């Protein structure tokens, strides 16, 4: 399958494309605003995210650091991201469907839409000023907002037992992006796919 990743914010991101233990396509490319990043998945991967990462550097080799999102110091990703990290989800081919999310779950850092290139279902989107608001203990020094189980680490926050509610701090990502996931036991926003779809994640949207 085939993911467009867009930067249209003003601002350069690193985005990352990975499952979890692999990379997905070359699992990270610099986009400067403007630039399209076309990648290869696989039909039938699961549990894929796409994200962006902010203010990296990296050296020849591709080793760095980034302030948000960063996936063990590698420009090609082939692990997940530090939060806070709005999060593109994805697992294709499920029986005939793709199912598609955006997650707030480990935080957000760039606004995002993530709409389907071909017919048949939807897209979603979390668009809104988070940063600009986000309460004030869940402010990354760095960059972004975090979760409340990244600050805190409580059962309820983290929903360890697989038992947990809404939060004061779930709830704040939850009113500013109904789409998106704002806990682990959200109501799901989870959109369903025909089988084989192709995408487009776009990083600021409404930039």
């Given at each position: 399958?085939?993911?467009?990743?867009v930067?249209?914010?003003?601002?350069?991101?690193?985005?990352?494309?990975?499952?979890?233990?692999?990379a997905?396509?070359?699992?990270?490319?610099?986009?400067?605003?403007?630039?399209?990043?076309?990648?290869?998945?696989?039909?039938?991967?699961?549990?894929?995210?796409?994200?962006?990462?902010?203010?990296?550097?990296?050296?020849?080799?591709?080793?760095?650091?980034?302030?948000?999102?960063?996936?063990?110091?590698?420009?090609?990703?082939?692990?997940?991201?530090?939060?806070?990290?709005?999060?593109?989800?994805?697992?294709?081919?499920?029986?005939?469907?793709?199912?598609?999310?955006?997650?707030?779950?480990?935080?957000?850092n760039?606004?995002?839409?993530?709409?389907?290139?071909?017919?048949?279902?939807?897209?979603?989107?979390?668009?809104?000023?988070?940063?600009?608001?986000?309460?004030?203990?869940?402010?990354?020094?760095?960059?972004?907002?975090?979760?409340?189980?990244?600050?805190?680490?409580?059962?309820?926050?983290?929903?360890?037992?697989?038992?947990?509610?809404?939060?004061?701090?779930?709830?704040?990502?939850?009113?500013?992006?109904?789409?998106?996931?704002?806990?682990?036991?959200?109501?799901?926003?989870?959109?369903?796919?025909?089988?084989?779809?192709?995408?487009?994640?776009?990083?600021?949207?409404?930039?």
């Amino acid at each position: 399958a085939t993911f467009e990743i867009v930067n249209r914010c003003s601002y350069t991101v690193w985005a990352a494309a990975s499952k979890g233990d692999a990379a997905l396509d070359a699992g990270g490319r610099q986009l400067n605003s403007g630039e399209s990043w076309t990648i290869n998945v696989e039909p039938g991967t699961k549990g894929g995210k796409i994200w962006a990462r902010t203010d990296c550097y990296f050296d020849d080799s591709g080793s760095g650091i980034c302030k948000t999102g960063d996936c063990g110091g590698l420009l090609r990703c082939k692990r997940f991201g530090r939060p806070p990290t709005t999060l593109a989800e994805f697992s294709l081919n499920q029986y005939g469907k793709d199912y598609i999310d955006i997650s707030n779950i480990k935080g957000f850092n760039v606004p995002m839409d993530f709409s389907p290139t071909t017919r048949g279902c939807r897209g979603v989107r979390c668009a809104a000023d988070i940063v600009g608001q986000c309460p004030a203990k869940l402010k990354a020094p760095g960059g972004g907002c975090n979760d409340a189980c990244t600050v805190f680490q409580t059962s309820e926050y983290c929903c360890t037992t697989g038992k947990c509610g809404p939060t004061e701090y779930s709830r704040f990502f939850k009113r500013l992006c109904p789409d998106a996931f704002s806990y682990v036991l959200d109501k799901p926003t989870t959109v369903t796919c025909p089988g084989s779809s192709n995408y487009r994640v776009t990083f600021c949207p409404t930039a």
